[PDB]
Amino acid sequence: PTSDDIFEREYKYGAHNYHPLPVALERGKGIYLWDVEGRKYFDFLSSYSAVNQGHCHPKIVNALKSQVDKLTLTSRAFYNNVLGEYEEYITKLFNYHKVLPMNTGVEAGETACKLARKWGYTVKGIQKYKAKIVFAAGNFWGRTLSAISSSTDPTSYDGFGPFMPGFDIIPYNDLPALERALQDPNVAAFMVEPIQGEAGVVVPDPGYLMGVRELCTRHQVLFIADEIQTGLARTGRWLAVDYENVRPDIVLLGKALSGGLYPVSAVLCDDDIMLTIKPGEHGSTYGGNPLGCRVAIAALEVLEEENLAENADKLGIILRNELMKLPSDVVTAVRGKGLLNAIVIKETKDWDAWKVCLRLRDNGLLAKPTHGDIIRFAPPLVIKEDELRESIEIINKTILSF
Amino acid sequence: PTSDDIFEREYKYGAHNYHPLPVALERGKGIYLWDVEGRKYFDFLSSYSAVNQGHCHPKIVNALKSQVDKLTLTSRAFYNNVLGEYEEYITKLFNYHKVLPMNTGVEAGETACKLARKWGYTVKGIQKYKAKIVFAAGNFWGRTLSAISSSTDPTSYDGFGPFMPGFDIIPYNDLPALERALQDPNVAAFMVEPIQGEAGVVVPDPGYLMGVRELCTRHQVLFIADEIQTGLARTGRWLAVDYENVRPDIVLLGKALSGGLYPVSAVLCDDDIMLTIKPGEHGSTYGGNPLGCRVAIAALEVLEEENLAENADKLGIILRNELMKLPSDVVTAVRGKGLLNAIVIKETKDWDAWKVCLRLRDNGLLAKPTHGDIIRFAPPLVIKEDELRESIEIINKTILSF
Amino acid sequence: PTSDDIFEREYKYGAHNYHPLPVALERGKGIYLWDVEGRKYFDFLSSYSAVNQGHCHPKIVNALKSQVDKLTLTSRAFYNNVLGEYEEYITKLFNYHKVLPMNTGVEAGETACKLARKWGYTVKGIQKYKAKIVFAAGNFWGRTLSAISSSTDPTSYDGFGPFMPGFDIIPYNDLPALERALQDPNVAAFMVEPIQGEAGVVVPDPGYLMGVRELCTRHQVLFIADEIQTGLARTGRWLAVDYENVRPDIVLLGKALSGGLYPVSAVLCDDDIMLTIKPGEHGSTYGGNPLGCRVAIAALEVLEEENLAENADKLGIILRNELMKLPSDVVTAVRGKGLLNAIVIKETKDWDAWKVCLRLRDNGLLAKPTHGDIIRFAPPLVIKEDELRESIEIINKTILSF
Ligand SMILES: Cc1ncc(COP(=O)(O)O)c(CNC2C=C(C(=O)O)CCC2)c1O
Ligand SMILES: Cc1ncc(COP(=O)(O)O)c(CN[C@H]2C=C(C(=O)O)CCC2)c1O
Ligand SMILES: Cc1ncc(COP(=O)(O)O)c(CNc2cccc(C(=O)O)c2)c1O
């Protein structure tokens, strides 16, 4: 019942794999969240880009409610009338031959690694089990053994047994390093985030994505774009990669694909790649279930109908321009695209990002630091200019109160 | 004859592999340098740590002058009376069984890689040509094909053909990454600089070197310490690694080993490692020549007799403490050990490190930026407190004139 | 103090990467060397062609002595008044646009490989990292990982980890093999020694160098001539390649470039090749230092003023003609050009080249076998006919005493 009671209970019956910001939410609608004491807050995290369409979006909620009375899961042992409709929809929306439905973001990543590997052997001709996938330092795509194996962050891999072989890491936003890495004919793919979220919203230099595409094509290497956090209007486009008109070989979607109402994930690619996996060689119990498909279609429609991409683009500019007005002795950097932004706090003797977020919380705005001194600002794409302007002032006062 | 004439001539008859600070020196003594116009300057670069003992140190100069009239080079085909004297001296000074004499820093590095590899196969038992050497990102140990192959800096490797296999790179100042890397039994060694010079004087966290030593020992991996720039009193100790009482398996020395009077390099290690290389398997025409050995002995004696290490330690503190008094909107960071220091210039619309160095030059102090916004401050170890204090003020005025 | 004490000391404190001829020299002047017991010897090795001008040549010694009191090293971070003077001198002497100054022979070689590669990509248009450099079997250009990678001699490469990719080897003195090799458009250069020194003074057939030049030009491949041992009057010309009037694309000089007083190396080529390397892409701490430049200028002047080339040519003929008078059951072959010569000892049950060299030593002449049965005879170019005649008799008696 009480925030402290809630914290207390979780601490007793739940694993301590997290250290959340001490706020106990019980309701959320649009850009707002309310804790157990009734206090309202601006959501400047969007569940890590999962609630782009805002919390409990009516249209998506309706889709869930209508389908639950009909069918929720049959398993892929049999067909369900909804999946194919969703598949046709998403493949045409993103312009790819097929889609492989999964549940979580890591799963989409695993699927991509399996597609890349399978393709490397069956199509590229790499000798069995000598295939490698290159990743960029600072990457974050999940918590599976394989995912943490490509991580350069000790917090993800330290203490977690022997790691997955075949994973090469190179610096991010580095075309020369990529080119150097692609000299090995055993490389099957390169997986990259158009903008690294958890690394601290690190935006690569303009031309980077074009370079990656040119390099991968030239060396017969698959370009896997992890758009699980940057895609679906978040950065101001359907896919962050759209900013440079780049067409990755494989695109990974997740989070906002369901508006935060169901774990839905997707991996898009053409037949020459997708069909390397035969019947019975890959799957998931919940992947492609009826319920998740209806919410996915609805979540995608919301993004389309409400032109959330153009909104994100317009308002992001304002957000960044205003944030840049803050004192350099305070905010050392402001970066992002669309509504995926972050500020770098100059950690000193007294203050730090956590403290800023605690006080920010006290002033009605919810956010969390990514790397101790980096604070992410990513409010639902349904936010309005005035609402943005109000939150911006909450950020200003908090920042200027230390 | 004229500075501009000098620049002009070099531009016409010399390769453009450099873009030096526009100053044409013709004389140097101790901490001072004089250009062709007679203008005196404080040397805050020390020829990249090669003139620790100061320019044209009388004692070293005498050693060179006496030996040149006797013998300079016989080649290693025959013995010369000087080499063995030097060997006994340096091995006992640094407490290692033997020393392999070479000329340049890269050569010492190459020798270490060859020792590591040879040892990996003959002693560790690694299968022929599967041995790997791990390096830390940001490393810089020369310009040979092999050296640039371990580099993460595009300026060193871009455009320079296929690279040397067997070189693994991990982040610097990262014990978890090292440990993860040492899981491969094929790793023969880990080469690290106690403090990365060219990376921008990046000092690892206290305990790092102890961790590296513990990790290497535990995994039967050679710990190669590149002390070519941090050693010989530069950081305040005979070897920077002395700060944590760590004993690397192989130590690389160069630069100041001759006071800047002759290219002399050295690789120190015990018999179990050194003796893996048999007669006729490694060498150099000039390595271990009589002339270089006399200057080397003299250069080492100067460091000892004049207690330059303790001086570097004492004055470095002052240098850093004073530099830290500068405005944060100007100097964003000050780092170093002994007289190996650097400041990070907040590059803005108007100013940058090059400009600061140009004006610094105009005010009588010579220094050069390492990475566009990083300026190194490393004056000869023979500098005095008042002289340091004077140069410090030259730095202050220049910094505060923008 | 004693020869055996000297051998003993080195064996204890120095790496065993060599097995020199048991002679402990302490002084050398001109063509003579004196050991610790005062015994005088004729130097028939010239420090592997490093002391062409004779040991401790007064003119070169003076140059070193004058410059040491002024400036020795500033580093390439700043300009020094001497370098440009030397550059203008050497470029005009050899008739090439520019010169890239380095320290050791291998470094000049590495620089050439980097120039060839860089040129291959930026000017020839070879795809990134597919460029190859062809070498001739029996080649020897140093001890770096890259250098040993082109070696066909097990003693240089065996046990030294994975090798450098992109290095193709073809038989020496073989135009058809070269032509066949140059069919691959990815070949950027061909590095050759006009006469292979360490292979055992193997002189190619007349017309070979002309063929190489015609072939390289026709296939847009750089002709890199390693004149580090054959150049600077040693064979009877400024460059051994002068014998056929061939102009290589890149010329490598070293050893005698300083008369054995300082490690000085040089790589000469025109702008279209030299300028492919931009500022900050290649260098060396000691490369182009003031001290080395003065000795280099002096060493070159000595060669010029004293007409050492014509002397080497004249006396070499006498040396070879006399050596050929030896019994075939003893000396199976006599070869060379200028003062770069060698005899092939018919190794039998009792005698061998080492033994001949040991007894030769006992008779006052110092030489060393290159490949067990090949003995090199290369005395300083300052030798006189009578002195040569005397040494020739020492060779005769020794050879005829078995
Ligand atoms: C870019 C990216 N790709 C994949 C994933 C993994 O998605 P999930 O498996 O559905 O979580 C992510 C993860 N995004 C975050 C998850 C967090 C969490 O574990 O609590 C925190 C922060 C980001 C991303 O980012
Ligand atoms: C730490 C370290 N180790 C080796 C070397 C290479 O030694 P050299 O072959 O003697 O140069 C260096 C190089 N230091 C610098 C060299 C240059 C240059 O090539 O001009 C510039 C800056 C530093 C080390 O730093
Ligand atoms: C033809 C040639 N090119 C380059 C080199 C290497 O120069 P270095 O200055 O030694 O780096 C050489 C090496 N010449 C040599 C012959 C015998 C023995 C040695 C040695 O002891 O390593 C060197 C040649 O020949």
DSSP-assigned beta bridge partners for residue A343? A334, A375
Give counts: helices (H), strands (E), chain B: 14, 15
Q: How many angstroms is the resolution?
A: 2.3
- The secondary structure of A284-317 as a DSSP string is -SSTT-HHHHHHHHHHHHHHHHTTHHHHHHHHHH
In a shared domain, residues C244 and C120: yes
3-class secondary-structure state, position B330: coil
> Which of A43, A226, A249, A313 is labelled catalytic?
A226
Residues 6+ apart with CB under 8 A from B4: none
* Ranges assigned E (strand) in C207-358: 222-226, 250-253, 265-269, 331-337, 340-345
Q: Does one domain contain both A191 and A340?
A: no
How many CA atoms, within 13 angstroms, populate the side-chain half-sphere of residue C49?
27
Neighbors of chain B with 3 or more C-beta pairs under 8 Å: A, C
Cβ–Cβ under 8 Å, residues C375 and C367: yes
Given B306, B340, B367, the domain boundary residue is: B306
Which residues lie below 8 Å from residue A14, measured CB to CB, with a gap of 6+?
none
Is the Cβ–Cβ distance between B399 and B393 less than 8 Å?
no
For chain A, after which residues does the C atom lie more than 2.5 Å from the next written residue's N, i.e. where is it broken? none
Q: What angle (nearest 5°) sits at the alpha carbon of residue C315, between those of residues C314 and C321?
A: 100
Residues B341 and B219 in one domain: no
Helices (H), B161-289: 175-181, 208-218, 271-274
Query: CA-CA distances (angstroms) from residue B304 to B53, B227, C296?
Result: 10, 17, 32
**Cα atoms found within 13 Å of the Cα of residue B174, Cβ hemisphere only:** 21
Residue whose entry in the numeric block shows the structure tokens 């004087």: B201
> For chain C, how are helix, strand and coil distributed in percent, rounded to 5?
40, 20, 40
What angle is formed at CA B377 by the lines to CA B372 and CA B380, rounded to 5 degrees? 140
Experimental method for this entry? X-ray
Please report which helix (H) or strand (E) contains residue B108, including its range: helix B105-119
| Helix count and strand count (H, E) for chain C | 14, 15
Rg of chain A (C-alpha set) = 21
Cα separation, C243 vs C236, in Å, equals 9
DSSP C14-57: B--S---EEEEEEEEEBTEEEETT--EEEESSHHHHT-TT-BT-
Q: Nearest Cα to B21, choosing from C79, C73, C84?
A: C79
CATH of the domain at B73: 3.40.640.10
Q: Which residues line ligand 3 (CB under 6 A)?
A: B 76, 283-286; C 48, 104-106, 109, 140-142, 193, 197-198, 226, 228-229, 254
- Selecting from A162, A171, A183 the residue whose C-beta is nearest the C-beta of B162 gives A183
Query: From CA B252, how far away is CA B105, in angstroms rounded?
Result: 8
Matching residue, tokens 């106990």: A24
The length of chain B, given as a count of residues: 402
Instruction: Tell me which H or E stretch contains A354.
Output: helix A353-362
Chain C hits for A179, Cβ within 8 Å: 128-129
**Does residue C275 share a domain with residue C373?**
no
- The tokens describing C5, both together, are 């004490």
With a 6 Å cutoff on the Cβ, whether A231 touches ligand 1 is: no
**Burial degree of B205 (CB within 10 A; 0-12, 13-18, 19+):** exposed
**Number of domains present in the structure of chain A:** 2
* Whether residue C184 is found in the same domain as residue C295: yes
Q: Which residue has the tokens 């649009």?
A: A30
**Helices then strands, each counted (H, E), chain A:** 14, 14
- Residue carrying the six token digits 């070099």: B10
- Name the nearest CA neighbour of C150 among C184, C110, C186: C110
Is there a contact between B151 and B144 (Cβ–Cβ < 8 Å)? no
Which residues in chain C are contacts of A183 at CB distance < 8 A? 128-129
**Six-digit token string for A241:** 């990669």
Token couple for C50: 């490093």
B9/A contact by beta carbon, under 8 A:
no
Cβ-Cβ contacts under 8 Å for A388 (sequence gap 6 or more): A315, A318, A319, A379
Residues 6+ apart with CB under 8 A from B129: B166, C161, C162, C163
Q: Name the pairing type of β-strands A250-253 and A222-226.
A: parallel
Element (H, E) at A118: helix A105-119
Nearest atom (ligand 2) to Cα of C285: 11
Give the 3-state secondary structure of residue B55: strand
Q: Which of B155, B140, B29, B100 has its CA nearest to residue B276?
A: B100
Q: Vertex A28, ends A27 and A31: CA angle to 5°?
A: 155
Q: Sort C327 into a burial class: Cβ within 10 Å, 0-12 / 13-18 / 19+.
A: exposed
Q: Are residues C51 and C159 in the same domain?
A: no
Co-location of C259 and C233 in the same domain: yes
Strand order of the β-sheet with C187-192 is C98-102, C265-269, C250-253, C222-226, C187-192, C132-136, C167-170
Distance CA C9, CA B91 (A): 12
Structure tokens at B187: 């790793």
Phi-psi region of B255 (alpha: psi -120 to 50; beta: other; left: phi over 0): left
CA dist A25 and A27 (Å) reads 6
* Same domain membership, residue C194 and residue C162: yes
* Contact of C3 with C23, CB cutoff 8 Å: yes
Residue type, A357: C
Query: Distance between CA B123 and CA B125 in Å, rounded?
Result: 5
CA B60 to each of CA A177, A381, B56, B57, C67: distance values in angstroms, whole numbers, following the listed order: 44, 71, 7, 6, 14
**Tokens describing residue A226:** 């992890």
Enumerate the β-bridge partners of residue A133: A167, A189
**What is the rounded distance in angstroms from the CA atom of residue C83 to the CA atom of residue C77?**
13
> Two tokens at C332?
């199976």
The bound ligand whose nearest atom lies closest to the alpha carbon of A48 is 1
- The CA-based angle A259-A260-A264, given to 5 degrees, is 85
Asked which of B249, B282, B306 is the last residue of a domain, the reply is B306
Cβ count near A402 (within 10 Å) = 13
Strand partners, B100: B267
Please list the residues that pair with B222 across neighbouring strands: B189
What chain C residue is nearest to B187 in terms of C-alpha separation? Answer: C161
B200 plus B164 within the same structural domain: yes
* C170 CB-near residues (< 8 Å, 6+ apart): C134, C135, C136, C137, C177, C178, C180, C181
* Catalytic status, residue A140: yes
- C199 and C69 in a single domain? The answer is yes
From the CA of A371, the nearest ligand is 1
Give the distance from residue C207's alpha carbon to the nearest chain B alpha carbon, in angstroms. Answer: 31
Q: Which residues span the domain enclosing B233?
A: 57-306
Q: Give the pair of three-digit tokens for residue C243.
A: 């014998």
Pair A149, A275 in one domain:
yes
Task: State the Cα–Cα distance between residues C25 and C17, nearest whole angstrom.
Answer: 19
Which residue has tokens 């007793």? A12
Provide the H-helix boundaries in A130-185.
145-149, 154-157, 175-181
Rounded to whole angstroms, how far apart are CA atoms B265 and B106?
A: 9
Q: Are A269 and A97 in contact (CB under 8 A)?
A: yes
Residue type, A239: L
Domain closes at, from C263, C289, C306: C306
- DSSP assignments along C238-273, one per residue: SSGGGGGT---SEEEE-GGGGTTSS--EEEEE-HHH
H-state helical runs in C37-143? 46-49, 58-68, 83-94, 105-119
What DSSP letter does each residue of B284-315 carry, written as one string?
-SSTT-HHHHHHHHHHHHHHHHTTHHHHHHHH
Q: What are phi and psi of A358, to 5 degrees?
A: -70, -45
Q: What's the rounded Cα separation, in Å, for the pair B197 and B194?
A: 9
Residues linked to residue A33 through DSSP beta bridges, in sequence order: A28, A41
Closest CA to C70 of B35, A69, A338: B35
- Examine the residue annotation and report whether A226 is marked as an active-site residue of this protein: yes
Residue C322 sits in a domain of what CATH number? 3.90.1150.10
Residues B320 and B192 in one domain: no
